[PDB]
């Protein structure tokens, strides 16, 4: 009998706050999906005969390149794999700068339908919004330092100690761990995009990595551990159906 124990509970901090329960309900029902898509994959390695026959899809999902937290003068901010910049204000609203930068989406959150957006141009921009772009204009200057399809944005984040969790609008979950190993789940818990500290993206079917016993190529990853951290990560995030 293997003498082992469950990992300590996942304590979180500085999550972006939201009122729209239904939005939480979607995330909760969405997290559980990619989690069930993984349990279904772990079952493919365990006792799946010829688990690699009918090929699985292959596509590089979106991801977060550089990110920051801020408390007072500005809100949490981030940048994506499309040279896009987002700003999750302290109130909960988001402003997103597109790749080609002629335009920008302004996202709010509502209880009835959930997240809701509206298209504007920087040139045909309104008044009350301009002061929100002053904030973005600074993150643009900061982010600028550096040492189509249906677009995407960040819904919720959660700062745990061992890592930080990103929940995206396209159904893609991302994790920047402590040891700078960064990973991502997309396609409903079927594809794996490990991006080492060396910013190199490569996607893999989950059933292919499970048989291997580790991340492909990189042995210093300690993969079998991080997977466990993802699971309980989604488990906790999937129980949040309400605000209380």
């Amino acid at each position: 009998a293997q003498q082992a124990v469950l990992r300590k509970e996942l304590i979180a901090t500085s999550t972006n706050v939201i009122k729209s329960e239904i939005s939480l309900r979607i995330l909760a029902s969405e997290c559980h999906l990619t989690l069930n898509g993984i349990v279904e994959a772990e079952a493919q390695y365990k006792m799946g005969g010829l688990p690699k026959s009918r090929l699985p899809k292959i596509k590089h999902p979106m991801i977060v390149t550089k990110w920051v937290d801020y408390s007072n003068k500005h809100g949490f901010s981030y940048q994506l794999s499309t040279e896009d910049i987002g700003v999750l204000f302290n109130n909960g609203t988001t402003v997103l700068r597109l790749a080609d930068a002629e335009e920008f989406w302004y996202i709010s959150y509502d209880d009835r339908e959930g997240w809701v957006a509206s298209h504007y141009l920087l040139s045909e921009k309104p008044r009350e919004l301009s002061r929100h772009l002053e904030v973005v204009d600074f993150f643009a200057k900061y982010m600028k330092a550096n040492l189509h399809k249906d677009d995407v944005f960040l819904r919720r984040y959660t700062r745990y100690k061992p890592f930080v969790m990103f929940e995206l609008s396209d159904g893609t979950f991302q994790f920047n761990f402590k040891d700078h190993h960064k990973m991502a789940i997309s396609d409903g818990g079927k594809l794996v995009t490990y991006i080492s500290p060396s910013h190199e993206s490569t996607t893999y079917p989950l059933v292919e990595v499970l048989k291997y016993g580790e991340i492909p190529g990189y042995p210093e990853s300690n993969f079998r551990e991080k997977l466990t951290l993802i699971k309980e990560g989604l488990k906790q995030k999937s129980t949040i159906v309400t605000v209380d």
Binding site: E113, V116, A117, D150, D151, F153, S169, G171
Partner: peptide, 8 residues
Amino acid sequence: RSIEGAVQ
């Protein structure tokens, strides 16, 4: 061009 993962 509509944004996936939210309502317009």
